[PDB]
Curated annotation (Swiss-Prot), chains A, B:
It comes from Methanocaldococcus jannaschii (strain ATCC 43067 / DSM 2661 / JAL-1 / JCM 10045 / NBRC 100440). PANTHER family: CYCLASE-LIKE PROTEIN 2. It comes from the Archaea. GO terms for molecular function: arylformamidase activity. This is Uncharacterized protein MJ0783. Gene3D superfamilies: Putative cyclase. Pfam families: Cyclase.
Amino acid sequence: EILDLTQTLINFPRPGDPELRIIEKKIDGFIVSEIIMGSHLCTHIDYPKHVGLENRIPFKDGIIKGKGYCISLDDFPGNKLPACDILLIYTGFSKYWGRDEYFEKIPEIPFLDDIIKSNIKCVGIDACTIGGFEEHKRLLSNNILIIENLNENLKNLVGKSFYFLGLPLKIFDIDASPIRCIAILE
Amino acid sequence: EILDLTQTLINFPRPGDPELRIIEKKIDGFIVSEIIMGSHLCTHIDYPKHVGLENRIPFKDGIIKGKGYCISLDDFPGNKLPACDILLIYTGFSKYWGRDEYFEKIPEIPFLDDIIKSNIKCVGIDACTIGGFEEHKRLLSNNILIIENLNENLKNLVGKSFYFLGLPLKIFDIDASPIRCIAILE
């Protein structure tokens, strides 16, 4: 039915980045909190503003949706990309989530050219990055959004077609937002 | 198809509550941000911790889902509640979103008793509150979650059956979270 692809929000920022802080207060019998987080913390979507470009409206209401397909990075050598709106890339690096090692695992995606020529609208990955500044800008400059730090459930989706929904914090004019991502399986 | 029921995140806290602050920095050609927000800012879900109780797992992965139904508060006098997992209540108070007046508009829901006897799992409303501490605790203490500050699109849903999805910031052990809410119409 529904598979959650989001990591639980934890204080596991990229080194250099703001820590997660949740400040709880007791007031008149209610418990209330303040949340302090960097925009790139945990499962998040990058917008073009992140690399100094103007954001656009590729998705109505900013709701990431459409047919999804998941490929394994190691299996996918000289292939036709799947016909999909959202391409998920399973690296296996999610195995290392929550461990410092994780931020040293940088995927090498040899078929970025092909993604840029496709009608893919967003790429998601179970890793901290799809690559460097240049790789991010290459995608973002060509109106392809990027979702990072997806969880290990991408493993379950490899070779499968599913419907993808990514619901960010409804902010516009930001470089990035925390995003809750699910796969709806048939 | 998909109707977004979420308010855009803006610096419109309940008086007394933390302001929204988004701090943007330029670093090595990237633009990055820090987000500071109260847990009850804009469209949010209340958990039992908000009234000093223990959170449970009524929804798998914390994903609010199921059959939805929307009723108009003024039309709904002595009625059978709809058969639904998620009950939305349209007050019209969303008309005043972003205006100080909005936080003075407090719904009076005479059928709270009936909600407590139903199998409804969550109640959502286009208003700042469903009522006072006692009304919140009455629902939360009986394992019914509460979504506040839904938008004016609830008007479009009155009398309709739809599928509801509410995707919060994946935090557990918090009193409340910002939640992105949609209706999937047939």
